[PDB]
Design an enzyme around this catalytic site. Structure first.
Site, PDB file in Angstrom:
ATOM      1  N   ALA A 130       4.304  -7.660   2.261  1.00 42.71           N
ATOM      2  CA  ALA A 130       4.366  -6.427   3.041  1.00 42.71           C
ATOM      3  C   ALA A 130       2.942  -5.938   3.281  1.00 42.71           C
ATOM      4  O   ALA A 130       2.002  -6.453   2.675  1.00 42.71           O
ATOM      5  CB  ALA A 130       5.190  -5.368   2.298  1.00 42.71           C
ATOM      6  N   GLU A 148       0.532  -2.243   4.047  1.00 38.80           N
ATOM      7  CA  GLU A 148       0.444  -0.786   4.061  1.00 38.80           C
ATOM      8  C   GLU A 148      -0.190  -0.089   5.270  1.00 38.80           C
ATOM      9  O   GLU A 148      -0.784   0.976   5.109  1.00 38.80           O
ATOM     10  CB  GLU A 148      -0.284  -0.324   2.793  1.00 38.80           C
ATOM     11  CG  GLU A 148      -1.802  -0.616   2.761  1.00 38.80           C
ATOM     12  CD  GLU A 148      -2.180  -1.987   2.200  1.00 38.80           C
ATOM     13  OE1 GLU A 148      -3.364  -2.159   1.841  1.00 38.80           O
ATOM     14  OE2 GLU A 148      -1.319  -2.890   2.123  1.00 38.80           O
ATOM     15  N   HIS A 151       5.208  -0.001  -3.735  1.00 37.30           N
ATOM     16  CA  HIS A 151       3.842  -0.506  -3.658  1.00 37.30           C
ATOM     17  C   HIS A 151       3.129  -0.111  -2.364  1.00 37.30           C
ATOM     18  O   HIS A 151       2.049   0.486  -2.398  1.00 37.30           O
ATOM     19  CB  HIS A 151       3.854  -2.032  -3.785  1.00 37.30           C
ATOM     20  CG  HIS A 151       2.491  -2.648  -3.815  1.00 37.30           C
ATOM     21  ND1 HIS A 151       1.847  -2.974  -4.989  1.00 37.30           N
ATOM     22  CD2 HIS A 151       1.644  -2.983  -2.815  1.00 37.30           C
ATOM     23  CE1 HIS A 151       0.662  -3.487  -4.711  1.00 37.30           C
ATOM     24  NE2 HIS A 151       0.514  -3.503  -3.398  1.00 37.30           N
ATOM     25  N   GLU A 152       3.729  -0.439  -1.223  1.00 41.97           N
ATOM     26  CA  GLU A 152       3.089  -0.121   0.045  1.00 41.97           C
ATOM     27  C   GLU A 152       2.958   1.385   0.234  1.00 41.97           C
ATOM     28  O   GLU A 152       1.965   1.857   0.794  1.00 41.97           O
ATOM     29  CB  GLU A 152       3.848  -0.750   1.218  1.00 41.97           C
ATOM     30  CG  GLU A 152       4.107  -2.265   1.100  1.00 41.97           C
ATOM     31  CD  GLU A 152       2.914  -3.082   0.603  1.00 41.97           C
ATOM     32  OE1 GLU A 152       1.751  -2.683   0.818  1.00 41.97           O
ATOM     33  OE2 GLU A 152       3.149  -4.154   0.002  1.00 41.97           O
TER      34      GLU A 152
HETATM   35 ZN   LIG Z   1      -1.091  -3.979  -2.174  1.00 39.36          ZN
END
Ligand SMILES: [Zn+2]
Length: 865
Positions: free
Chosen positions: A257, A259, A292-293
């Protein structure tokens, strides 16, 4: 061609604002970029813009066609510029031809981007370095029927209709950002819309974009996003800073993924889930990655990286944050156990390989090769050590000072450590060495109990073996947590000279002693509690000390860890026996330890399940200097069979006791199910007919994919009679679903069957497989090479030849996925001479490939050195 951290120099020019216009088309996209530039360096310095595979149309400075420029390898050099000016670049790119999936490319019928680390330069000529922060405005023009949704970072500030069925939308992101955070998505999607109201009252519109027909798999990701937002507020006091939060799930994506500010782009594997397609693991992974993102919004976006050598500044800290998120919401013990297995079994292997590097690299050829277990996972362990040394309160004060000082800028790892040190008043000068030194430290502990003085003494030593990248190694500041237990399992207060002593010992020298008095009885120690430092522990445990800890240790992690130490001894014993042609040998008291875990009515099912989950073949490999993959695989099966036989009745009792009619993605239920399926793994190796019936029954009666996959996996693992039938049934039912078939490809690739390679090669022609999709590639080819070392390392060398064929294709098609897949081959020095010869030959063949990618070149060179 290598770049060095010590060569960092501030940019001669900054770009404060950029207005982009994309005339979108899969075959030919026209990019118009208007940048406001400001010179900071020498007045005679030229502006050097990065660019890759671009067709330059024109260059203007303040609307004046520019004649003072030259194109060179990977760059556009512009000379004789004013101090402040408007740069206008027009160039063309071809998304449809982008098979590397870097820059602007095609994912199915959609168009999307991936700009990190240096993908934006594949879109237009720019200052593609993270310390250049600009305010972006993005106008997208495209065919309305094919691309009804046109998205970019920020808020929609303009929109209109055009002739010939085209339309446009303009986005504005108020936050200055490095170009690696730029994102653009165009296509037709189904959209799940929701809202989250921050603690202070900011209403945030949440939008999850998925391919048409995937709405039934979007709610969990949306729920996880809201949980992530709430947790960051509660734990770190951080609120989202924009009005909208968009996430787009795409099928073709090299990373898990990304961000991108306000417009995250996710590999669909970390978004899509429903009970019949996803397992408990998938649900928890989606929770982990969505979080996380989201956490990157502050640790990565509001405060970014000065240069790529500082990658861990955001990745180590954000991984730490996602682990704390998962741990707070679920079982902390299970999360810690899982993360330590990754460190010991996968990251340690990397630190013992030709690619070894400190969490803050000093030398890089291809930056995409450094989104590693080291930078991410060991990076998080380093952040966790800071947390261990400071405590939650001071750690948060450090986070607060970090943001106060660096919010809105590009910072360094050192800046972060300095903030932590300044806010807590804890000296981290020595600790900083963790950022500059590669390799896994080895901590040796020797003890002594003196009955005459009632003192317990720990003599602790440390050393980090030299690595290919560093001939010099020095002692580190190692937080070494301990706990002492008396004969009844009660904690013995740590003290000396009438003063209490902190349980976290500061192991800072090559050798030192720690004395504890008022130790009235010989203690059993728990060492390196909760894996307090990412090191290998050498202590001469007795089997009884370990089984004692399995029963009395206060923290559940210690109980699991003790079991690992106990098993290590016998895994090593039996691999040696295997090489001598001898069968498995295990002392009775060892099987007794696991029988006790099964029958313990007070133990958390979550812990029992992990203790009953044997270390993977990759975890086992790290117990040896020279790896014998075949011995390891056969010993793992033999150990499974022996425990299955000795604990047959207990295993079945616990399997039945944990049956759950209702399926819930809730931690208590997940724990019971994980335990039930852990038992199933062993039961699969019981009397054939009995095992075949039990396994086939679970596969057919399962009301969720977790139980169905557990049964299917057992059928393959034990080569049960029902295997072929179940595998075909799964294929017939799920062939149209790539994410679901990936589980099937993994099972095929990691099968213990003698003809596994033949099967894997044949599956390259399977209707559900395609070399154009990174997920398919990793689930079939990657799983074979990296998760089936026994077959990959077949003595005839067939495994290496197969990988070479695949990499010959991928080197040209998608260098990043190729680089992920070559990792197993660069571990050659860990194997016997015969295997090394074949692996070196394979690497030399790849080294001679025409158009060898920098991604592979970097790894091949290090492996052949
Ligand atoms: Zn990361």
């Amino acid at each position: 061609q290598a770049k060095y951290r010590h060569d960092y120099r501030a940019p001669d020019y900054q770009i404060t604002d950029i207005d982009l216009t994309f005339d979108l088309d899969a075959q030919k996209t026209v990019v118009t970029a208007v940048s406001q530039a400001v010179r900071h360096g020498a007045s005679d310095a030229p502006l050097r813009l990065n660019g890759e595979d671009l067709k330059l149309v024109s260059v203007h400075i303040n609307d004046e066609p520019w004649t003072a420029w030259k194109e060179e390898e990977g760059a556009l050099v512009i000379s004789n510029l004013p101090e402040r000016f408007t740069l206008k670049i027009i160039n063309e790119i071809s998304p449809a031809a982008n098979t590397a999936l870097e820059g602007l490319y095609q994912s199915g019928d959609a168009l999307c981007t991936q700009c990190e680390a240096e993908g934006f330069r594949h879109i237009t000529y720019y200052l593609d370095r993270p310390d250049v922060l600009a305010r972006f405005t993005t106008k997208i023009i495209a065919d309305k029927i094919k691309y009804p949704f046109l998205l970019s970072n920020g808020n929609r500030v303009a929109q209109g209709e055009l002739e010939n069925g085209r339309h446009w939308v303009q986005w504005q992101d108020p936050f200055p950002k490095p170009c690696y955070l730029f994102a653009l998505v165009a296509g037709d999607f189904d959209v799940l819309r929701d809202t989250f109201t921050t603690r202070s009252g900011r209403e945030v519109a949440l939008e999850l974009y998925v391919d048409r027909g995937n709405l039934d798999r979007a709610p969990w990701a949306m729920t996880s996003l809201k949980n992530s937002m709430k947790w960051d507020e509660e734990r770190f006091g951080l609120e989202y800073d924009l009005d909208i939060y968009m996430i787009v799930a795409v099928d073709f994506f090299n990373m898990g993924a990304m961000e991108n500010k306000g417009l995250n782009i996710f590999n669909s594997k970390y978004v899509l889930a429903r009970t019949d397609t996803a397992t408990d693991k998938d649900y928890l992974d989606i929770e982990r990655v969505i979080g996380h993102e989201y956490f990157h919004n502050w640790t990565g976006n509001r405060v970014t990286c000065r240069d790529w050598f500082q990658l861990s500044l955001k990745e180590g800290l954000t991984v730490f944050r996602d682990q704390e998120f998962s741990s707070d919401l679920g079982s902390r013990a299970v999360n810690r156990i899982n993360n330590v297995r990754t460190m010991r079994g996968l990251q340690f292997a990397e630190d013992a390989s030709p690619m070894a590097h400190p969490i803050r690299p000093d030398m890089v050829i291809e930056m995409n090769n450094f989104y590693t277990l080291t930078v991410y996972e060991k990076g998080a362990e380093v952040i966790r050590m800071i947390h261990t040394l400071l405590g939650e309160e001071n750690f948060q004060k450090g986070m607060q000072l970090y943001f106060e000082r660096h919010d809105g800028s590009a910072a360094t790892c050192d800046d972060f450590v300095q903030a932590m040190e300044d806010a807590s008043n804890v000296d981290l000068s020595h600790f900083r060495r963790w950022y500059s030194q590669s390799g896994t430290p080895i901590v040796t502990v020797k003890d002594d109990y003196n009955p005459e003085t009632e003192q317990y003494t720990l003599t602790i030593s440390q050393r980090t073996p030299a690595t290919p990248d560093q001939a010099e190694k020095q002692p580190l500041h190692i937080p070494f947590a301990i706990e002492l237990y008396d004969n009844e399992g009660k904690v013995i207060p740590l003290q000396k000279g009438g003063h209490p002593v902190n349980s976290v010992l500061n192991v800072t020298q090559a050798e030192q002693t720690f004395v504890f008095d008022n130790v009235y009885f010989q203690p059993v120690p728990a060492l390196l509690c909760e894996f307090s430092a990412p090191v290998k522990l050498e202590y001469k445990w007795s089997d009884q000390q370990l089984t004692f800890l399995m029963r009395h240790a206060r923290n559940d992690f210690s109980r699991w860890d003790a079991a690992q130490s106990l098993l290590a001894t016998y895994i090593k014993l039996n691999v040696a026996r295997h090489q001598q042609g001898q069968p498995l040998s295990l002392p009775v008291h060892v099987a007794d330890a696991f029988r006790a875990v099964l029958l313990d009515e007070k133990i958390d099912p979550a812990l029992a399940a992990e203790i009953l989950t044997l270390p993977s073949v990759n975890e086992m490999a790290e117990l040896f200097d020279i790896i014998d993959p075949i011995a390891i695989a056969e010993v793992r099966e033999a150990l499974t069979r022996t425990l299955a036989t000795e604990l047959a009745d207990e295993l079945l009792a616990i399997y039945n006791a944990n049956y759950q009619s209702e399926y819930r993605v809730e931690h208590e239920d997940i724990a019971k199910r994980t335990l039930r399926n852990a038992c199933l793994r062993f039961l699969a190796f019981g009397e054939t007919h009995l095992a075949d019936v039990l396994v086939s029954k679970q596969f057919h009666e399962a009301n969720n994919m977790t139980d169905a996959l557990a049964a299917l996996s057992a059928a393959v693992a034990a080569q049960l009679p029902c295997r072929d039938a179940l595998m075909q049934e799964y294929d017939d039912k799920w062939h149209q679903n790539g994410l679901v078939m990936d589980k099937w490809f993994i099972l095929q690739a990691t099968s213990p069957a003698a003809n596994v390679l033949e099967t894997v090669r044949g599956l390259l022609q399977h209707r559900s497989f395609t070399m154009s999709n990174p997920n398919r590639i990793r689930s079939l080819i990657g799983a074979f090479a990296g998760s089936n070392p026994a077959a990959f390392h077949a003595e005839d060398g067939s495994g290496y030849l197969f990988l070479v064929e695949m990499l010959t294709d991928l080197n040209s098609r998608n260098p990043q996925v190729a680089s992920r897949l070559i990792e197993p081959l660069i571990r050659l020095k860990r194997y016997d001479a015969k295997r090394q010869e074949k692996m070196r030959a394979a690497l030399e063949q790849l080294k001679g490939l025409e158009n060898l990618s920098g991604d592979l070149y970097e790894k091949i060179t290090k492996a052949l050195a």
